[PDB]
Structures are given as C-alpha cells and as structure tokens.
C-alpha cells in the first residue's frame, strides 16, 4: 500500500472530521460532504486504473453523477431553511429535540 492511497484516506478522514465538527454554516457541512465525495472519486479512479479493471471505469462517473444529485437535493433543503429563518446557522434547527 503506497503513500498515495494513505494520503487519500487521510484526506477523506479529515473531511469527515470537518463535517462532524459543525461550527456553523450548514453550507460548510455540504462542502465537507462533497470533499469526502471528491476523495472517494480520486481513490476509486486510482484503484481502478492501477489494476486495468477496464469494465470498472464506469464506476467513478456513475458515482459522481449520483453524488452530485444528492448535493443538489441538499442545497434545496438548505435554501428552505434560510427562507424560514433568514440565515443558515446550524443552531437554529432546535425545534425538534429528544
């Protein structure tokens, strides 16, 4: 296992930690999700190209498409939150509680 894969997994872990930290600005949470997705794309592309698994070259593109769709969905939700509160601070979503 070379250092490139280690660095890519480190980037994914850092992006996951950033997503889970949640300072504010839900847009930052979406950005962290998409950074995780980009790391996934890079890692999968490297793994598939290294082993000459030809028929698997479809996998990254497909992945990207679906993930981008999710991003769009997320953005929509974010917009509605702002339209109800005027801003997208995370701490405003406290009506529902355990």
């Amino acid at each position: 296992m070379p250092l490139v894969y280690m660095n890519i997994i480190m980037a994914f872990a850092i992006a996951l930690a950033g997503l889970l930290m949640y300072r504010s600005h839900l847009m930052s949470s979406l950005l962290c999700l998409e950074g995780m997705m980009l790391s996934l794309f890079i890692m999968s592309t490297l793994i598939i190209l290294n082993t000459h698994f030809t028929l698997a070259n479809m996998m990254p593109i497909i992945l990207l498409v679906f993930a981008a769709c999710e991003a769009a969905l997320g953005l929509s939700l974010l917009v509605m939150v702002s339209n109800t509160y005027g801003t997208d601070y995370v701490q405003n979503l406290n009506l529902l509680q355990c």
Partner: protein, 347 residues
Amino acid sequence: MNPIIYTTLIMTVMSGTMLVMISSHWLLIWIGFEMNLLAMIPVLMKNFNPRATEAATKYFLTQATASMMLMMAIIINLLYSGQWTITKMFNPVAMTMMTMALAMKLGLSPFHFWVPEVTQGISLQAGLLLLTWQKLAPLSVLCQISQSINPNLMLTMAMLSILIGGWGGLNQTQLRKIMAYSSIAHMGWMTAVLPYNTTMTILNLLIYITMTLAMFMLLIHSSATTTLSLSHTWNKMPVITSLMMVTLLSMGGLPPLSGFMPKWMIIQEMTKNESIIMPTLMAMTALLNLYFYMRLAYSSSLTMFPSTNNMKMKWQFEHTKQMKLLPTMIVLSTLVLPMTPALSSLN
C-alpha cells in the same frame, strides 16, 4: 402534492429498496440506497411546515453521511481484494466502517439521535413509512454479510440500543417519540441475533413491522398525537382504545400475545451458543418498554379521562375513510403465537 407524483415517489422508494435487496454488486446496492434517500425526502415534506423541513434536513444529513461511509468501506474492500460481489468482507477496517454505515442507516445507538426528532417533526403517515419500510434494505445487507461482522461490535451496539430505547421511552409524552424509541429498542433486540441466526432476525422484523403498522394505523384512525389527545378517544370510539391496549400489551412481550414470539425465540438461539448473560440483560431491559406501554394503556383505555363538551358534535359523524388491512394487522400482531413453528419457512 399531486397524487400521481406521490405515487411515483412511493414507487421509486420501493424500487430502490428492491434494487438493494435483489442486487449482487456493491455499486448497485449503493445506487439503490441513493435512490431510496433521494425519493424519500419529499414524502417527509408532503405537509409543508418548518418542523417537517428541519426533520427532512436532519434525515438527509444523516443518510448522506451513512452513504458516504458505506462507499468508502466498499472502496477499501475493493482495494484489499478486487471483488465487487457482496460476500465476505475480506478486510477488518472495511467491515467496521460498513457496520457503522449500516448502523447509521438503521438507527442503532449511539447513532440513534436522529430517529426521535425526525419522527416527531414529520407526520404520522410519513413516520409509519419511515419506521417500517426503511429498515428492510440495511437489514438485508447486514444479513447478507453476517458471517463477516464482528460479534463484539454488533452485540455491544445492540445492547446499547436496547438500553437507550428503554430509558428514553419513559420520559416522552408525544406518541411519535415513544414510537421512535420503541423502534430503537426493537432494532437493538433484532440486530443482536444477526451473528447467530438471520432467520430469527427476519422473523423479528416481520413481527415488529406488523405490530408497528397496526399501532400507527390505530393512531391515524383516532387522530391523536399527544397522550391527552389519545386519552380523549374513549369517548367516541372505545373499540379503538381497547384494540390499541391489546396491541400495546402485545408489543411489550407479554405472552400469549404474538409479541412474545420473537424475544423468546431469539433468547433460545442465543442460549444455543452459550450466551446467557446477554439475553437476561435484554429481557430485564425490555421491562422498561413494557412499563411505558403500560402507562400509555392506563392513560388511554383502562381509565376514563375527562372529556370536552365539543366532543358531542363528533358523536354524529363517522370515519369517512377506512384503511384496509387494519383488522388483519391487529390479528397478526396479537394472536399468532400458536403458529410459531411456521418460522421454519425461512420467512
């Protein structure tokens, strides 16, 4: 929304779950999960309001994080063994991460925090669909790789889920949060027998789905969300309160009602593998579920709470819409203990 669009979204949710269950490729399973998540969001937001929007965004964040973790686990498994088929994981780290992803998707503790709030924000119909249908894909995936899952992680997460559900159900007053904690506890019960016998997992899933479908249909029939709104029901439809109390007793594990069949059977299986302490602990913990079910039954049917004058007008009107399969659900969730051996059908 338009009825055609609602039907299309429901078909898409079911198609995503079917694709997850009938596929032998990790990428196709991930695609099915993504389709399910994509089509499930508007179902939560059918009745537009700030609470529904907040619940939907919490659900989306949790599901997206779980899906990303699942894809990372798939990538690592592919890296350490160039296999796409859903079989032995061939890696410990990939198995651990996939177990966390499926726990996030299911709602097992400590990833359980989103379930009560999402259930509370969204409507009864949305909640009913979320509570029962969503469980089928992650549970199928877990059953398909049960030979590779680490018993320690699954067992400790199941024990924590049972404890958390039992403790959190005591405090809640709204019925939707009680149902969310009940679901958490039932899934803690159900995932504990995955390493040993998946047939018991499927049987518990079927019994739990029947019970919660019956209870949610009863709650929809008598349009009650809080405890007092349910207490008012006896003045109009006492039969509904009686049936709800019987179903609540069944859901607590009281024999000879149907809800005793899974727990008992599950215990039996864990006794075959020389696991004695854990089944005892889970039984004494399910006593808490029984307690808050009994409190709800006391509030609803066994005592007559004060009514209101305007309720007189409700005596003159009948329920215009009748939901089919409610009597069947009640009967299946209450009086099917004597047919326990039918579980050999590998249901």
